[model samples]
Structure formats: structure tokens, C-alpha cells
Target: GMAEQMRRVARLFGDWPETIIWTCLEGTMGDIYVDDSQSPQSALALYGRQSFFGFLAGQPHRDLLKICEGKNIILVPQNQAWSDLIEEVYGDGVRFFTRYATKKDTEFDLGHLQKLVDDLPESFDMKLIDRNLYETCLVEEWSRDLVGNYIDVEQFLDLGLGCVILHKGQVVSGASSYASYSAGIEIEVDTREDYRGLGLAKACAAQLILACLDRGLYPSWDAHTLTSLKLAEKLGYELDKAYQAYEWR
Candidate 1:
């Protein structure tokens, strides 16, 4: 059952971050937050996994209800488990979005990807970074000192996919497709704060997608923000699913 679920999740999301690996459980619910400073009093977005279990778990959701009696809470379930749970528990209170067909193709070539980057607006430039270099940069982003963050680098490297883009040789945008699944690859991109509002992110993301397609993989979209959703749409990714996450007080 564990392997089956793992396969399902892995296949469902394609490329997951090793730091955020998935685990299956017979049953699990939580009132715990990583920090006590974080409380459930304020609004929260509950994603698919936690929402499914939280609805069925009752304890956490009941506690949450006490703390957030009249507060607006949104739940986005990314998977079938949570969707089913929400329908049963909250009914009309919850809404369902469209499910996208995870896609894959092996005939893609990186040449097109490179060509796309070459055509980026005159103000931007892109480059490919190896695993070691990408991890080094990510550690700084995470604010980890050499050793502790060294572990983080190891995790990112293990995924075996990394790339970033630069504007005037300064890092401005980048992404990676790692921890792949049966159906597709997952990509995460970052546009440097100063470089926002430029089309650099789309340029870099296109490179990553093209690389995956060349490898006979499909690019999967998981948007953390509206900007990302818009970018996915530009890249021709149809809606797959949207999920929100929450914590019970």
C-alpha cells in the first residue's frame, strides 16, 4: 500500500523536492506547527494532503473551528483523497476545480530550448548551472551556513536536475525539474527580487520544460502563486489542480 501510494503521489506531481518528500500513513492529523509563534488564529490556506486528513481526523479541525469560528478559511485539495474528504465533510462549503491530464513526450530537444533563451528580450541572458553550482546558490538563498546547508545541497543535487538564468551575468531567474514521477516532471523557478516584472522567468522555465521534453518527460505545473499560474498558462500548461494548506489550532 505504501509503495502504491508513493507511486501514485510521485506520478501525480512528477518531480518533487527531496526536502518535501511525501510519506503515506494509515491515518494522520496534526495540531502541531513547526513553531509556536505560528498559530491558527489567522487565515490559512489548506492544501490537498492536510485538508483530506484534517477533515477526517476531526480533532484538529474541531480545534481549528474553535479558534477560527467565523474566520474565512480556504481549503484546496490537490488530490482525490482530500477532494473526497471535503465533499463528505463540508459539502457545498468546498469547491472543486478541474483536473489536468499530466502529459509527457520524449522527442523534445534542448536545441529549441537554447534557441528560446537566445531570443529573450535584449535586457536578459540565461545560462545552465550544474548540480554543484545550483546547490551552492540555493544554500545562500536558504540562509544556511556551509555545513547545515551542505545537507540541503546534497538533497538538491540528488534530484540530478538544475538550471538558472542570468541577466548581465547576475542571477535573475532559474528553476529545476527533479524527483520525477511516472507522468511528468515538476519545475520550480525563482526570479530575483530586483528582476521581477521582466519575462525572464518564462524564458528560463521554457528551457527547463524543453529539457524535460527532450528526455521524454512532460513538464508538470504546481503554482505557488498567481504569477506562476499565469506563467504556466503562457507555456501552454492546462490546469491540473490547485491545493491550499492549513493548520489546526
Candidate 2:
């Protein structure tokens, strides 16, 4: 019953590289809104990792854009024109930003990434995420996004993939699927506070990329921070677009 609306909205985002958008449209993880349920003119897909808005050519859909007002929001318009429209409409109400992109047609050097697998420093055990590890990731705020979107271990085991670094049997750092579309997963990588600069996330994320490649799954990445951008480059993804976002918190 609710399925047709998604198909209509999906058109507005046509082939957009962000998997979180489709993850919502496919009824998996988030929500979608359309200016018209039938023969829609605009669409907004909202996922906690980020939000995206797409419009019919030249129609900005200002009414729908205001939906973020008064809430903590992070948004990416389809292009510069739409971003300009957002700023025009919001005035000082939003914070401007940019999150970098990587070429979707990336060909990573697998052997180099495999070497990073051995970069896991001494005193840490690298483990493939089993049910226990998934549960452990869920218990900590810092570690939560490593397995955050999965509803349960069985679901994660069936649909998602992850690699974690354990220190004294505690989940210290790792990388995992932040969101998955039909073709690939949006990567989420993180490490514990005390473990920062230990090269833990680089090692864990490296193995996760290797795991994805071996299985023929593309591990998609977007860099929302300077640190995150550097990490992706270190793993062999060349940078692509630099674009605008609006944030409020």
C-alpha cells in the first residue's frame, strides 16, 4: 500500500550516489516525504545519518524545506541551485557546511588495504563481528553506529558486515556498514576516545573494506569531517565533489 509513493520519490533522487536515500525508499531504515503522493513534484528522504531533498526542475518546494525548522537537522540539497534556495529561505537559521565525496567508480588497491589489516597494533585482537560482537557494539554510545542500524544479530548477520578491534576484550574500534542499499553499504567507522591516534580505526576499517571487496559488495564512503576525509583517502578512495549542507543542532 505504502510502496508506490517510494517509487515516485525515488525518481527525484535518480541515481544519486548516497545509499542512505535508497535505504529509506526501499522501506529498510528511514522515512520519505513527497509533495504529492501521486505524480509528485518533489521528494525528501530522511535518514539519521543525513537527509536529502530533490525537486522538480526549478521548483524549490520551500514549504517542504521548512520542515526542518526547530529541529536538529542536517541536509543536502541535490545541487548548488537547491543549496542556494535553502540559504535564501532560511537566512540565518542554518549553519552552512560541506561533506566531501569519493568517486563511485573507485578501484582500490586491495593488497595495500590487506597490509593495513596487519596494522592493528599489538595487544589488540581483530575479530569478524559475531553475534556477541554485534551486541557489544550496541551497548556503547561510541560503538553503537558500528552496528546501529541493524535490528538484531540475525538481521545483521544476514544483511550487514563489520570488523572490530578488541582491547582487553572490549570493543575499542572498528568499521561497519552504516547503511546498506541493494548494491553497497555506506561505511561508518569509529574508535574509542582513549584509543585515538593508535591507528586502530584505520586497521579495522581496512579489513572491513577488504571483506566487502571479497564479497563483491561496494563499500561506499562520504567524508563529513576532515578527519574522516583523510581516512578514506588513506584507504585508497580518491576525492570527488565538494558541496554544501545546512546544519542545525
Candidate 3:
């Protein structure tokens, strides 16, 4: 049964992050909404059912409208066909937004980035996130949402991977897997308000990427903002084509 479901979703997996799909596969995430259980091989949407983000694939169906109605949700359709279906059904209630797909570059250098991280001030410390430090990581508002909804601390320590930068005991910046697939992870990076522009996010992200490489996993990134696009570029991610998605509020 699980094999069939995975196969169906796998066929629709393209350049998108597919974090929700992976999370669902891991059996830790819940609230998946699909058009047909008998035809799990058809169009499917995986999310918290009430979360702001979700993934769509295979074909578009009116079943999605029930889940998306009156919610401030962003559904990333797999193609223009699905996008058109959503727009046709939802009409003026939804606004379109653009996002960039970024992938790692083969020729980009990581040596300089590692050096930059190594040269940080003595007061700064970067390390792998553990269960004990979960609360500490949540000290910042931004970090609270990074992986909080997807997995618990126990699961994160056991199956998830992340790196956080601390300055005098406060988490200033961090990078963690937003969602994970069989051989890679979707990256989410954030720096505290006061720490912006100081390269903290970059340094922390570098650590996370290196950690992923050590484990033979690829770290993928998708940029929702220009700032994120620039940061991904800095980390050797080649900016890919921009795509449109519907955001309902």
C-alpha cells in the first residue's frame, strides 16, 4: 500500500522541494489530503491540512478546493495545468506569487565559504542541533517555525539534521532541514533581526551543507524572497526559473 502511494507521488515529483511528500513517507507527518484513496495514484496534496504550505501533484481536482477554502494556504502545483485548474476554481480569492527554484552548481567553490566560517569571532559557536538545545533554538521567533511543525525533538535528533550558530548563548542564526527526501533535504535558513548582514546565516548554512555532504545527502533550496535568492547564489546554488503559485487568504 505504501509502495503504491510513494510510486504515485514519485511520478509527479519534479524540481519542487517535495518536503511534505518526504515527511509523509517518513510516517511522522500527518493530515494528508488526497482526491481519491482508491486512486492514490492520482492527484494528491500533502500538508497539515491547515498549514500554510502544501504540495500538489498528478492532476488537479475539485477535492483540493475543500481543503483550501477560506484558509491562508499556499499550494505549490506541480505544473501549469494544475496552476490553471486552481486559478479556474478559486478565481479572485487567490493571489499569485513567484518563487525561484535553486540548485547547487558543480563549479562553485566551498573552500572559501568554509574558511569564512572558520574565521568567525571567538565568541561565535556553531554546532549540530540536539534535543537538549531545542528550547534554546526556539529562543528566536524565526527558529521556532523552522522545523517545529514537521518533527519533534526526538525525531529531529534521530532522523533530522541541522546546525545553529550561537553568540554568547543566544541563537543568532541557524540552518536546518525543512523537509527531507530519501537522498536530500530542503534547507531553511534564518538569522535574527540584529544579526542580519553579518554573514551569520551564510556561515550557519555552510555548516549545515557540509554536514549534509558528510552524510551523502544533497541539500536543496527554494527561494521565496530576493534576499533568499541572493543567499542561495552565495552558497553556489544556480538560480532556476521562477514559477507562480496561488496564495489564498
Estimate, for each residue in 1-249, the C-alpha lDDT of model 2 and write its tens digit: 456666666777887777777687778766777677777777777665322332222246776676655544567788677777788887787788878888888889888998899766689999998988998998888888778677678878888999899999888998998777787788889999999998888898899898998898999888877788899999988888776777753
The alpha-carbon lDDT assigned to residue 90 of candidate 3 equals 75
- lDDT for each residue of candidate 1 in 62-81, tens digit (9 for 90 to 100): 33233333333333333455
Go through the candidates in order and give the C-alpha RMSD of each one to the true structure.
9.8, 3.1, 3.1
Q: In model 3, what lDDT does residue 49 have?
A: 27
Q: How many backbone clashes does candidate 2 have?
A: 0
Report every candidate's CA lDDT.
Answer: 0.46, 0.78, 0.71
The parts of candidate 2 lying over 4 Å away from their true place are 1-6, 49-58, 66-73, 88-93
Candidate 3: worst-modelled 10 consecutive residues by lDDT: 42-51
Error of 1 at 200 (Å): 0.5
Q: Candidate 3's residue-wise lDDT over 26-83, tens digit each?
A: 5555445666665653355555422356677767777765676665467788878888
Error of 1 at 135 (Å): 3.6
Assess the local accuracy of residue 114 in candidate 3 as a C-alpha lDDT between 0 and 100.
82
Best by TM-score: 2
For candidate 2, list the clashing residue pairs, or say none: none
